[PDB]
Amino acid sequence: NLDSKVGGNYNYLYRLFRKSNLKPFERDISTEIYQAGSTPCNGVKGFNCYFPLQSYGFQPTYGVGYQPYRVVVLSFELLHAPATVCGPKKSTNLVKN
Amino acid sequence: STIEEQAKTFLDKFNHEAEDLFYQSSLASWNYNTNITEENVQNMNNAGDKWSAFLKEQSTLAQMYPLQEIQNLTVKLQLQALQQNGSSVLSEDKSKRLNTILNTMSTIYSTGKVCNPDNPQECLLLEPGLNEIMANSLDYNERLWAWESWRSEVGKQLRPLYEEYVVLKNEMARANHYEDYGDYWRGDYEVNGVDGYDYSRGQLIEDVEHTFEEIKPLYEHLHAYVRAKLMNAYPSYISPIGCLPAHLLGDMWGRFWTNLYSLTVPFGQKPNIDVTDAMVDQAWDAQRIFKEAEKFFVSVGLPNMTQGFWENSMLTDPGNVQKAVCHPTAWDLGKGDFRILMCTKVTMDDFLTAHHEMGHIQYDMAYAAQPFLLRNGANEGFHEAVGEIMSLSAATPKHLKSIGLLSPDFQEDNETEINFLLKQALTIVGTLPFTYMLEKWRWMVFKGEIPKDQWMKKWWEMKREIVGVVEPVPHDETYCDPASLFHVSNDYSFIRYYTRTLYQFQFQEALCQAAKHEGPLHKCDISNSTEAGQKLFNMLRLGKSEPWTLALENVVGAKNMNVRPLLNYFEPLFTWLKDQNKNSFVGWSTDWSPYAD
C-alpha cells in the first residue's frame, strides 16, 4: 500500500551475483561488474559480463505472497561498555503513615 | 571455469529479466481484452514487441553455451527452448512475409461472412453469426448454403496463402535440423537425457495410430446410433451402410456432436439433470459461483485462491461502453498475479466451466515455485486436461446433491446415467477420430507425401475411413478445409485435443482408486477426499522440468498413453449401444457417396 505504485518502482535494487558469500554483518555497495567466466569485462556489458544490480517490480496487482515486506532487523549485542538502553519501568502509587 | 557455471549464471539472470517483461506483456493484453481503447491497442503491441525481441536478443548468447559440456538435466531443459532462434533462422525476406501471411489468414477468418442466398442484403459473419445458426438448424438446404458457400470465398481464397504457409514453415524446421514442420509439433513430447524414459519424436505417429485402433469398436457403435436417428429424416441420402453428410454434424467443421444431443435422447419420458432452474431459486450471483468452486479445491487438499484473484476477477460485461471478450480464458501473468476473463451468466454450463477456468489457475499454483523457464505444462495436452477432470467430478450427481443443487430424492438409475454418458460421448468420442484425421493429414502434407493436387483427394477419401463422413457436393483442389479452421489458420496446436482425452481419463481412474471409491467410474467423486489430492500435487508442481513420461508414472503408473481408462469409463454406454445396434449394421463403407448411385 506504500512502496508499490502503478508503473513499477525501480528505485529499490538488489545484488544478484557475487563471486562469493558475504560475511555476517557486512555491507558491500560496490557496483563493479560481476565476471562469470575468464572473459575480461572492464565495466562493459557483454559475454560472461553481467550488471549485478536488478530491479524489484512493484505494483499493487502482484500476488500477496510476492508483495514487498518492509523488514526492520534489530541487532542485539552485549559489549563490555556500560549498559544504557533498558526496558520500560512502572511507577506505582505513593502511600504514607 | 566450467561451462555449467557459465550457463547457470546466464540462466539465473535471464529468469529475472524474462519474468519482468512477460508480466508487462501479459498485463497489456489484459487491459486490451477487458477494455477496448486506443491506448490499450498500442500498449499491447509495444509490450508485445519488447518481449518478443527480448527472446531474440538472448538467443544469441544462448547458442554460445553448448549442451555437450552440461551434465545437469535441469540446465539443458532451460537452454533447450532458448537454443532455438525462432524465425531468425529464416531469411530476411521469408521472415517478414511469414508474419504477413499469419495476419492475413487471421483477418480473413475474422472478416469472412456468407451472405444469405434468399436475402442478399443481410450478410452474417461466421462467428457468432453462422456458428449459432448451424447449431439449431434442422434444414437440409439452409445448412448446406452456409457450409458450402463459406469455403468458396474462404477455402479457395486461402489456398495460395496456405501454400506459402507450408513453404515458409518447412524452411524453419530444416535450419533447426528437423525432418519437417510436422515433426516440429512432435518435439513437444521429446524426452532425452534419462535412461529408459527416452521418447522419440517419430514414436507419436505410431502411438496415435495404435490407440485409435481400439477406439474404432467404440466409435462404430456410436456412429451407427446417431445415423439410425437421422435415417428416418432422409432415407435416400443417408444409407444404413453409408456415411453421414458433412453439414449435418451440428456445426461447420463437425468438431463436437453435442448439438445433436437433443434428437438422440434415448428416453424422453424421464427428466434430465439441470442446475439452471435450481440456481434461480437459490438466487446466486457470479460472486458465489467461484466461491463454491473454491471450496472444491480445499476439500482435496489443494491451496485456496489468493485475495487478489477474487478481487480482480471480471464477472460480467458492462454493456457496450467497455467491451470484454466473453470467451472463457485463464490468463496467467506472473509473480502470483492470476486473473480470468469470462462473462458469467446463470446456466448449467457456466457451473462446469467455473471448475475448468479455476482448474488452470489451481494448476499454475503448484509449479509457480519454479523458475520462469520451468513454469509451463509438461506438454500441450496437460494444460486443459487438469481443468476437465475438475469439471467431470462436479457433473456427477453425487457432487450436486452435496451442496444442494440437485434434490436428494432424485432417482438415479441406468436410464438416467445412460442419458448423461451419451452427452459426454458426443463431445469426447466424436472428437478423437476428427482430431486424429486432421492432424495426420497435416503431417502427411508437411512431409511431402501428398502432392498439391491430391490435398482434397486424400482429405475426403481418408475422411470416410476415419470419421465416416462424405461430402454432399464434391470439391476440387481449389478448396482447402483446414485453411478455414480456427486452429490451423491461427497456428495453434491441433494435437493437444487428441492426447487430452487419454490423459484426463487416466487421471480420473487413478484418483478414484487412491480414495477407495467403489462401483462404476462415472459415479466417482473426488470431493472431501484428501488422499487423491496429495498424489496429484506431486506431479502438478513438476511442470516440464521433469520428463512427462516420468511424471505420468508417478500417478497412473503408466509410461505412455493407454486406452483402458477410455473403455472402462464408457463401458456402461458401450454395452447399451451394442444391444440397440443389433437391428442395424455396425460400421460404415467408404464406397458410398450421395451423388454416386
XYZ file of C-alpha atoms in Angstrom:
694
model
C 0.000 0.000 0.000
C 3.034 2.326 0.080
C 6.113 1.245 -1.882
C 4.318 -0.368 -4.825
C 2.850 2.063 -7.356
C 1.298 1.937 -10.813
C 4.004 1.519 -13.439
C 6.675 -0.064 -11.239
C 9.272 1.255 -8.804
C 12.883 0.809 -9.932
C 14.459 2.741 -7.040
C 14.956 -0.383 -4.893
C 17.622 -2.735 -6.263
C 19.442 -5.858 -5.088
C 22.737 -7.635 -5.731
C 22.029 -10.776 -7.751
C 25.586 -12.004 -8.422
C 28.734 -12.044 -6.302
C 31.943 -14.063 -6.542
C 31.455 -15.454 -3.017
C 29.168 -15.266 0.016
C 29.106 -12.221 2.279
C 30.326 -12.390 5.860
C 27.869 -11.794 8.721
C 27.074 -8.094 9.202
C 28.850 -6.971 6.027
C 27.604 -4.347 3.560
C 29.025 -4.194 0.024
C 27.929 -1.224 -2.103
C 30.409 -1.915 -4.920
C 28.833 -1.570 -8.370
C 31.719 -3.367 -10.121
C 30.530 -5.628 -12.928
C 30.448 -9.300 -11.966
C 32.634 -11.555 -14.124
C 31.184 -15.049 -14.510
C 33.951 -16.598 -16.612
C 37.502 -15.737 -17.621
C 36.438 -13.240 -20.303
C 37.606 -9.694 -19.447
C 34.782 -7.253 -18.703
C 36.301 -3.841 -17.833
C 32.923 -2.316 -16.982
C 31.456 -3.113 -20.420
C 28.462 -5.435 -20.649
C 28.882 -8.459 -22.880
C 29.542 -12.184 -22.932
C 30.019 -13.525 -19.377
C 29.741 -9.941 -18.070
C 26.568 -9.059 -16.176
C 25.380 -5.999 -14.279
C 24.758 -7.332 -10.750
C 22.021 -4.952 -9.596
C 18.471 -5.908 -10.581
C 15.144 -4.159 -10.043
C 12.151 -5.115 -7.903
C 8.890 -4.895 -9.826
C 6.413 -3.054 -7.572
C 2.712 -2.785 -8.448
C -0.426 -3.377 -6.349
C -1.578 -6.020 -8.860
C 1.015 -8.635 -7.856
C 0.063 -11.619 -5.733
C 0.045 -11.451 -1.953
C 2.942 -13.866 -1.453
C 5.351 -11.785 -3.545
C 4.257 -8.417 -2.135
C 7.263 -6.498 -0.757
C 7.627 -6.533 3.023
C 9.483 -3.814 4.918
C 11.796 -5.653 7.326
C 13.268 -3.998 10.426
C 16.030 -6.140 11.946
C 17.160 -5.223 15.467
C 20.727 -6.315 16.267
C 21.155 -7.072 19.980
C 24.813 -7.155 21.050
C 26.153 -7.014 24.615
C 29.627 -5.471 24.818
C 31.891 -4.539 27.729
C 30.679 -0.923 27.645
C 28.340 0.271 30.417
C 24.727 -0.693 29.755
C 22.374 2.168 28.896
C 19.269 1.100 26.974
C 16.828 -0.774 29.210
C 13.189 -1.808 29.149
C 10.383 0.454 30.350
C 9.716 0.833 34.058
C 6.476 1.075 36.046
C 5.529 3.586 38.742
C 3.045 2.728 41.493
C 1.085 4.813 43.988
C 2.711 6.506 46.983
C 1.328 5.854 50.470
C 2.383 7.372 53.794
C 1.894 6.675 57.515
C 35.544 -22.038 -15.135
C 33.298 -24.822 -16.407
C 30.562 -24.200 -18.967
C 27.964 -25.334 -16.418
C 28.917 -22.412 -14.169
C 28.683 -20.016 -17.119
C 25.381 -21.499 -18.310
C 23.808 -21.401 -14.844
C 24.877 -17.766 -14.435
C 23.168 -16.874 -17.721
C 20.014 -18.702 -16.623
C 19.933 -17.091 -13.168
C 19.931 -13.582 -14.651
C 17.635 -14.447 -17.571
C 14.888 -15.750 -15.270
C 14.571 -12.315 -13.654
C 14.604 -10.237 -16.847
C 12.274 -12.527 -18.804
C 9.813 -12.590 -15.891
C 9.581 -8.787 -15.679
C 8.876 -8.241 -19.383
C 6.459 -11.175 -19.667
C 4.316 -9.714 -16.876
C 4.060 -6.311 -18.564
C 3.381 -8.003 -21.906
C 0.563 -10.080 -20.409
C -0.773 -7.078 -18.483
C -1.015 -5.027 -21.683
C -3.030 -7.839 -23.270
C -5.254 -7.988 -20.178
C -6.154 -4.290 -20.316
C -6.808 -4.642 -24.054
C -9.092 -7.671 -23.699
C -11.112 -6.250 -20.795
C -11.334 -2.740 -22.284
C -11.195 -1.696 -25.940
C -9.349 1.629 -26.173
C -6.843 3.329 -28.447
C -4.294 3.320 -25.611
C -4.550 -0.410 -24.873
C -4.139 -1.477 -28.512
C -0.825 0.393 -28.655
C 0.370 -0.887 -25.268
C -0.247 -4.496 -26.315
C 1.865 -4.103 -29.458
C 4.574 -2.161 -27.613
C 4.853 -4.536 -24.651
C 4.439 -7.486 -27.010
C 7.322 -6.458 -29.267
C 9.627 -5.749 -26.318
C 9.159 -9.295 -25.011
C 9.305 -10.876 -28.477
C 12.556 -9.109 -29.372
C 13.949 -9.905 -25.910
C 13.982 -13.645 -26.612
C 15.638 -12.941 -29.969
C 18.488 -10.979 -28.370
C 19.004 -13.571 -25.627
C 19.013 -16.359 -28.226
C 22.374 -15.072 -29.479
C 24.020 -15.696 -26.101
C 22.099 -18.959 -25.619
C 23.633 -20.676 -28.661
C 27.125 -19.937 -27.280
C 26.665 -22.476 -24.437
C 26.803 -25.994 -25.924
C 24.800 -28.650 -24.095
C 27.505 -31.310 -24.518
C 29.536 -29.963 -21.577
C 26.498 -29.663 -19.265
C 25.803 -32.762 -17.163
C 22.745 -31.255 -15.434
C 19.278 -32.186 -16.672
C 17.513 -29.057 -15.396
C 20.048 -26.767 -17.091
C 19.765 -28.384 -20.530
C 15.961 -28.145 -20.460
C 16.072 -24.413 -19.707
C 18.535 -23.947 -22.581
C 16.517 -26.215 -24.895
C 13.921 -23.542 -25.692
C 16.462 -20.703 -25.731
C 18.719 -22.569 -28.172
C 16.087 -22.236 -30.906
C 16.328 -18.945 -32.797
C 12.656 -18.981 -33.802
C 12.157 -17.089 -37.055
C 15.735 -15.754 -37.040
C 16.914 -18.830 -38.959
C 14.715 -17.822 -41.900
C 15.885 -15.321 -44.494
C 15.039 -11.641 -44.087
C 12.509 -11.864 -46.927
C 10.855 -15.037 -45.622
C 10.837 -13.785 -42.022
C 8.915 -10.596 -42.835
C 6.468 -12.362 -45.168
C 5.776 -15.028 -42.527
C 4.039 -12.604 -40.161
C 2.102 -11.163 -43.109
C 0.522 -14.495 -44.076
C -0.400 -15.241 -40.456
C -2.038 -11.828 -40.043
C -3.809 -12.079 -43.407
C -5.304 -15.531 -42.815
C -6.411 -14.454 -39.335
C -8.040 -11.295 -40.706
C -9.943 -13.115 -43.465
C -11.244 -15.633 -40.922
C -12.495 -12.809 -38.689
C -13.869 -10.636 -41.514
C -15.249 -13.566 -43.518
C -19.006 -13.815 -43.950
C -21.643 -15.624 -46.004
C -24.496 -13.533 -47.373
C -27.961 -15.070 -47.197
C -28.902 -16.519 -50.618
C -32.543 -15.578 -50.023
C -31.626 -12.172 -48.513
C -28.609 -10.776 -50.405
C -28.751 -7.592 -48.309
C -28.287 -9.364 -44.964
C -24.768 -10.803 -44.647
C -23.865 -12.602 -41.418
C -20.340 -13.244 -40.176
C -19.220 -16.750 -39.242
C -18.650 -16.115 -35.529
C -21.052 -15.787 -33.765
C -23.497 -15.403 -36.631
C -23.055 -18.525 -38.740
C -21.815 -20.755 -35.906
C -25.011 -20.072 -33.939
C -27.416 -20.760 -36.817
C -25.737 -24.048 -37.777
C -26.306 -25.374 -34.242
C -30.123 -25.367 -34.163
C -30.780 -25.554 -37.924
C -32.631 -28.740 -38.898
C -32.997 -27.778 -42.575
C -31.080 -29.576 -45.312
C -30.709 -26.601 -47.667
C -30.165 -23.918 -45.012
C -27.219 -25.843 -43.560
C -25.760 -26.611 -46.994
C -25.904 -22.965 -48.099
C -23.795 -21.805 -45.146
C -21.436 -24.803 -45.241
C -20.720 -24.863 -48.987
C -20.597 -21.128 -49.734
C -18.102 -20.448 -46.931
C -15.178 -22.366 -48.447
C -15.949 -20.795 -51.841
C -14.786 -17.313 -50.796
C -12.554 -18.547 -47.941
C -11.152 -22.007 -48.633
C -10.494 -21.159 -52.278
C -9.110 -17.733 -51.337
C -6.807 -19.061 -48.596
C -5.312 -21.724 -50.891
C -2.447 -19.519 -52.200
C -1.963 -18.267 -48.641
C -1.844 -21.848 -47.341
C 0.697 -22.889 -49.983
C 3.030 -20.123 -48.810
C 2.336 -21.118 -45.198
C 3.656 -24.623 -45.895
C 6.822 -23.490 -47.692
C 7.841 -20.899 -45.089
C 7.381 -23.164 -42.063
C 9.274 -26.047 -43.689
C 12.420 -23.947 -44.141
C 12.426 -23.187 -40.410
C 12.470 -26.871 -39.448
C 15.282 -27.625 -41.905
C 17.502 -24.966 -40.321
C 16.634 -26.409 -36.886
C 17.700 -29.924 -38.016
C 14.116 -31.222 -38.030
C 12.789 -33.662 -40.617
C 9.774 -31.475 -41.464
C 7.373 -28.983 -39.912
C 5.123 -31.846 -38.821
C 7.993 -33.041 -36.637
C 8.229 -29.588 -35.031
C 4.952 -30.053 -33.156
C 6.053 -33.575 -32.201
C 9.120 -32.095 -30.486
C 6.985 -31.005 -27.533
C 6.767 -34.638 -26.381
C 10.505 -35.178 -26.943
C 12.317 -36.690 -23.948
C 16.079 -37.242 -23.800
C 18.780 -37.418 -21.144
C 17.266 -40.113 -18.894
C 17.988 -43.820 -19.328
C 14.924 -45.828 -20.341
C 12.469 -42.904 -20.361
C 13.644 -41.516 -23.720
C 10.748 -40.801 -26.093
C 11.399 -40.405 -29.816
C 9.567 -37.821 -31.902
C 8.561 -40.355 -34.558
C 7.017 -42.576 -31.880
C 3.971 -40.287 -31.652
C 2.897 -41.277 -35.176
C 2.720 -44.935 -34.133
C 1.136 -44.039 -30.781
C -1.841 -42.094 -32.148
C -2.347 -44.793 -34.790
C -2.263 -47.737 -32.364
C -4.515 -46.166 -29.722
C -7.037 -45.249 -32.429
C -7.422 -48.916 -33.414
C -9.047 -49.759 -30.071
C -11.208 -46.631 -30.399
C -12.835 -47.974 -33.596
C -15.160 -50.567 -31.956
C -16.407 -47.905 -29.532
C -16.816 -45.274 -32.261
C -18.539 -47.581 -34.764
C -21.349 -48.335 -32.311
C -21.896 -44.639 -31.569
C -21.698 -43.597 -35.229
C -24.346 -46.186 -36.118
C -26.524 -44.962 -33.241
C -26.505 -41.361 -34.484
C -27.126 -42.496 -38.068
C -30.158 -44.558 -37.021
C -31.829 -41.489 -35.506
C -31.328 -39.320 -38.608
C -32.103 -42.142 -41.058
C -35.878 -41.594 -40.965
C -35.474 -37.938 -41.984
C -33.587 -38.522 -45.264
C -33.504 -42.248 -46.089
C -32.339 -41.597 -49.662
C -29.246 -39.525 -48.855
C -28.407 -41.404 -45.630
C -27.562 -45.074 -46.294
C -27.543 -47.642 -43.462
C -24.092 -48.863 -44.546
C -23.108 -45.413 -45.846
C -21.835 -42.260 -44.174
C -23.419 -39.159 -42.678
C -23.362 -35.818 -44.527
C -20.756 -33.250 -43.535
C -23.139 -30.321 -42.987
C -25.412 -32.243 -40.581
C -22.701 -32.846 -37.947
C -24.158 -29.985 -35.860
C -21.674 -27.230 -36.755
C -19.396 -26.102 -39.578
C -16.397 -28.429 -39.189
C -18.043 -31.220 -37.188
C -15.801 -30.829 -34.145
C -18.419 -31.658 -31.491
C -21.650 -33.650 -31.789
C -23.211 -32.106 -28.656
C -25.602 -30.121 -30.872
C -27.227 -33.443 -31.841
C -27.910 -34.486 -28.233
C -31.472 -33.149 -28.485
C -32.685 -35.655 -31.091
C -30.513 -38.563 -29.874
C -32.070 -38.754 -26.373
C -32.716 -42.473 -25.724
C -35.564 -41.873 -23.248
C -37.581 -38.665 -23.405
C -40.041 -39.784 -20.730
C -37.539 -39.180 -17.911
C -36.249 -35.846 -16.564
C -32.671 -34.695 -17.074
C -30.253 -33.268 -14.516
C -30.100 -29.473 -14.790
C -28.790 -26.971 -12.235
C -30.064 -23.921 -14.144
C -33.530 -23.854 -12.566
C -32.001 -24.749 -9.187
C -29.682 -21.726 -9.083
C -32.576 -19.372 -9.886
C -34.494 -20.257 -6.722
C -31.281 -20.140 -4.676
C -30.573 -16.627 -6.063
C -26.856 -16.954 -6.752
C -24.657 -14.385 -8.493
C -21.244 -14.517 -10.153
C -19.553 -13.860 -6.797
C -20.659 -17.099 -5.110
C -20.168 -19.278 -8.211
C -16.384 -19.022 -7.915
C -16.665 -19.190 -4.117
C -18.414 -22.573 -4.122
C -15.888 -23.844 -6.676
C -13.013 -22.676 -4.463
C -14.201 -24.955 -1.652
C -13.879 -27.892 -4.058
C -10.116 -27.344 -4.211
C -9.921 -27.138 -0.410
C -11.642 -30.499 0.122
C -8.942 -32.263 -1.930
C -6.073 -30.587 -0.049
C -5.127 -28.015 -2.683
C -4.480 -24.428 -1.528
C -7.224 -21.827 -1.807
C -7.245 -18.720 -4.014
C -5.414 -15.530 -3.086
C -7.328 -12.376 -2.195
C -6.063 -10.698 -5.363
C -7.543 -13.459 -7.518
C -11.173 -12.995 -6.455
C -10.899 -9.191 -6.277
C -9.500 -8.746 -9.804
C -11.903 -11.215 -11.444
C -14.150 -9.896 -14.224
C -17.665 -11.180 -13.560
C -19.641 -9.595 -16.430
C -19.549 -7.220 -19.405
C -20.663 -3.653 -18.541
C -22.616 -3.123 -21.751
C -21.115 -1.771 -24.959
C -19.279 1.140 -23.294
C -16.472 -1.126 -22.051
C -16.425 -4.346 -24.079
C -14.704 -7.543 -22.964
C -14.316 -10.900 -24.681
C -16.798 -13.410 -23.262
C -14.764 -16.415 -24.436
C -13.649 -18.145 -21.205
C -9.874 -17.994 -20.822
C -7.476 -18.333 -17.884
C -4.762 -15.671 -18.148
C -1.547 -16.217 -16.173
C 0.516 -13.011 -15.995
C 3.206 -13.789 -13.436
C 4.569 -13.252 -9.942
C 1.401 -14.620 -8.375
C -0.987 -12.497 -10.466
C -3.886 -14.741 -11.523
C -6.923 -13.447 -13.415
C -9.762 -14.876 -15.507
C -11.803 -13.018 -18.142
C -15.245 -14.559 -18.624
C -18.843 -13.374 -18.935
C -20.684 -15.207 -16.151
C -24.404 -15.866 -16.558
C -26.580 -18.395 -14.725
C -26.526 -21.648 -16.717
C -25.694 -25.303 -16.184
C -22.614 -24.997 -18.419
C -21.137 -21.996 -16.584
C -21.083 -24.079 -13.399
C -18.877 -26.733 -15.007
C -16.912 -24.002 -16.798
C -16.054 -22.315 -13.487
C -14.320 -25.507 -12.353
C -12.430 -25.598 -15.660
C -11.317 -21.957 -15.595
C -10.249 -22.210 -11.951
C -8.532 -25.503 -12.776
C -5.876 -23.733 -14.839
C -5.255 -21.240 -12.027
C -5.059 -24.051 -9.473
C -2.695 -25.879 -11.839
C -0.368 -22.863 -12.053
C -0.050 -22.563 -8.259
C 1.816 -25.861 -7.817
C 4.788 -25.211 -10.122
C 4.800 -21.437 -9.510
C 7.876 -22.003 -7.314
C 9.851 -22.980 -10.432
C 11.906 -20.501 -12.482
C 10.232 -18.647 -15.339
C 11.756 -21.053 -17.863
C 10.458 -24.024 -15.842
C 6.914 -22.629 -15.461
C 4.779 -24.466 -18.041
C 2.878 -27.702 -18.547
C 4.840 -30.862 -19.243
C 3.189 -30.847 -22.684
C 0.410 -29.116 -24.625
C -2.237 -31.637 -23.542
C -1.809 -31.302 -19.779
C -2.961 -27.660 -19.789
C -6.652 -28.284 -20.486
C -6.743 -31.839 -19.095
C -6.255 -30.677 -15.496
C -9.279 -28.380 -15.735
C -11.513 -31.048 -17.276
C -11.080 -33.653 -14.525
C -12.256 -30.971 -12.095
C -15.472 -30.488 -14.084
C -16.095 -34.226 -14.520
C -16.321 -34.713 -10.751
C -18.687 -31.735 -10.495
C -21.044 -33.064 -13.189
C -21.649 -36.243 -11.181
C -24.970 -36.434 -9.288
C -23.059 -37.089 -6.052
C -21.374 -33.674 -6.024
C -24.593 -31.874 -6.988
C -26.527 -33.384 -4.073
C -23.738 -32.349 -1.683
C -24.117 -28.566 -1.999
C -27.881 -28.706 -2.561
C -28.299 -28.116 -6.302
C -29.932 -31.485 -7.006
C -32.707 -32.765 -4.766
C -31.671 -35.710 -2.546
C -34.799 -37.627 -3.626
C -33.791 -37.594 -7.309
C -33.879 -41.141 -8.665
C -30.536 -42.304 -10.079
C -30.654 -45.446 -12.221
C -29.442 -46.825 -15.550
C -31.920 -44.780 -17.595
C -30.648 -41.530 -16.062
C -26.938 -42.375 -16.304
C -27.023 -43.645 -19.901
C -28.573 -40.318 -20.909
C -25.694 -38.495 -19.198
C -22.936 -40.665 -20.682
C -24.305 -40.087 -24.190
C -23.974 -36.303 -23.897
C -20.315 -36.596 -22.892
C -19.674 -39.163 -25.637
C -20.774 -36.751 -28.372
C -18.147 -34.255 -27.188
C -15.469 -36.847 -26.322
C -15.883 -39.886 -28.584
C -16.705 -37.736 -31.606
C -13.593 -35.603 -31.110
C -10.914 -38.320 -31.264
C -11.382 -39.551 -34.876
C -11.821 -35.975 -36.111
C -8.672 -34.840 -34.288
C -6.677 -37.878 -35.432
C -7.856 -37.268 -39.008
C -6.886 -33.619 -39.476
C -3.613 -33.851 -37.542
C -2.432 -36.877 -39.529
C -3.391 -35.052 -42.731
C -1.196 -32.088 -41.787
C 1.730 -34.405 -41.016
C 1.441 -36.008 -44.465
C 1.175 -32.729 -46.399
C 4.007 -31.048 -44.490
C 6.172 -34.120 -45.147
C 5.592 -34.035 -48.913
C 3.904 -37.412 -49.438
C 0.772 -35.736 -50.865
C 1.158 -33.533 -53.974
C -0.648 -30.201 -54.023
C -3.321 -31.599 -56.356
C -4.189 -34.527 -54.051
C -4.822 -32.401 -50.931
C -8.604 -32.617 -51.299
C -8.429 -36.032 -52.979
C -6.865 -37.606 -49.881
C -8.853 -35.381 -47.498
C -12.324 -36.768 -48.220
C -11.017 -40.238 -49.109
C -9.441 -40.702 -45.670
C -12.432 -38.965 -44.051
C -14.891 -41.765 -44.820
C -12.381 -44.254 -43.397
C -11.829 -42.465 -40.068
C -14.913 -40.451 -39.077
C -17.204 -41.851 -41.782
C -18.214 -38.531 -43.355
C -18.822 -37.947 -47.073
C -19.292 -34.629 -48.876
C -22.681 -33.809 -50.439
C -21.019 -31.665 -53.136
C -17.661 -32.913 -54.490
C -14.816 -30.410 -54.214
C -11.733 -29.911 -56.372
C -8.218 -28.952 -55.262
C -9.186 -25.259 -55.091
C -10.952 -25.657 -51.744
C -8.983 -26.118 -48.523
C -10.858 -27.388 -45.468
C -8.153 -26.801 -42.789
C -7.500 -23.267 -44.077
C -10.805 -22.061 -42.608
C -10.266 -23.859 -39.288
C -9.526 -21.665 -36.278
C -6.512 -23.638 -35.048
C -4.782 -24.203 -38.400
C -5.162 -20.619 -39.637
C -4.014 -19.148 -36.301
C -1.066 -21.587 -35.968
C -2.211 -23.302 -32.764
C -1.524 -26.876 -31.691
C -4.180 -29.252 -33.025
C -2.653 -32.385 -31.454
C -3.389 -31.301 -27.866
C -7.059 -32.264 -28.288
C -6.434 -35.942 -29.101
C -3.990 -36.678 -26.276
C -6.075 -34.688 -23.774
C -8.836 -37.314 -23.806
C -6.406 -40.117 -22.946
C -4.614 -38.126 -20.229
C -7.779 -36.961 -18.449
C -9.273 -40.460 -18.179
C -6.044 -41.942 -16.806
C -6.030 -39.314 -14.054
C -9.742 -39.911 -13.436
C -9.132 -43.618 -12.807
C -6.023 -43.156 -10.644
C -7.508 -40.562 -8.281
C -10.615 -42.683 -7.683
C -8.513 -45.736 -6.805
C -6.483 -43.725 -4.282
C -9.619 -42.600 -2.416
C -11.043 -46.166 -2.415
C -14.157 -45.444 -4.473
C -16.230 -48.463 -5.497
C -18.613 -49.009 -8.384
C -18.634 -47.527 -11.882
C -16.191 -44.747 -12.669
C -18.806 -42.135 -13.597
C -20.190 -42.443 -10.052
C -16.837 -41.372 -8.582
C -16.475 -38.022 -6.819
C -13.120 -36.696 -5.603
C -14.647 -34.177 -3.182
C -13.980 -34.481 0.566
C -11.163 -36.933 -0.271
C -7.734 -35.564 0.663
C -5.822 -38.722 -0.315
C -6.143 -38.222 -4.082
C -5.107 -34.563 -3.948
C -1.765 -35.428 -2.363
C -0.701 -37.895 -5.066
C -1.684 -35.430 -7.800
C 0.006 -32.409 -6.193
C 3.428 -34.041 -6.603
C 3.115 -34.063 -10.402
C 1.417 -30.662 -10.721
C 4.453 -28.870 -9.267
C 6.922 -30.572 -11.631
C 5.823 -28.905 -14.863
C 8.121 -29.534 -17.811
C 11.226 -29.511 -15.587
C 10.838 -33.312 -15.492
C 10.025 -35.692 -18.370
C 6.292 -36.111 -18.897
C 6.822 -39.874 -19.153
C 8.386 -39.858 -15.677
C 5.732 -37.605 -14.128
C 2.965 -39.739 -15.641
C 4.330 -42.882 -13.968
C 4.150 -41.225 -10.534
C 0.339 -41.028 -10.814
C -1.160 -43.743 -13.031
C 1.906 -45.997 -13.125
C 1.974 -45.919 -16.938
C 4.844 -44.720 -19.127
C 2.669 -43.892 -22.160
C -0.912 -43.423 -23.315
C -3.403 -46.226 -22.697
C -6.953 -46.850 -23.922
C -8.017 -48.929 -20.883
C -9.458 -45.928 -18.953
C -11.167 -44.793 -22.164
C -13.067 -48.085 -22.473
C -13.872 -48.559 -18.775
C -15.425 -45.115 -18.299
C -17.507 -45.638 -21.463
C -18.190 -49.322 -20.683
C -21.757 -48.770 -19.334
C -22.582 -46.897 -22.547
C -20.808 -49.405 -24.806
C -22.982 -52.266 -23.535
C -26.192 -50.323 -24.214
C -25.160 -49.240 -27.720
C -24.306 -52.809 -28.748
C -27.821 -54.056 -27.955
C -29.554 -51.199 -29.802
C -27.369 -51.600 -32.915
C -28.218 -55.289 -33.414
C -31.076 -54.324 -35.747
C -28.694 -52.099 -37.757
C -25.298 -52.550 -39.410
C -22.270 -51.861 -37.210
C -19.713 -49.894 -39.211
C -19.724 -47.995 -42.486
C -18.341 -48.306 -46.011
C -16.123 -45.854 -47.886
C -17.530 -46.706 -51.339
C -20.867 -44.926 -50.766
C -21.467 -41.377 -51.996
C -24.625 -39.234 -52.019
C -24.098 -38.113 -55.635
C -22.902 -41.546 -56.850
C -25.643 -44.164 -57.188
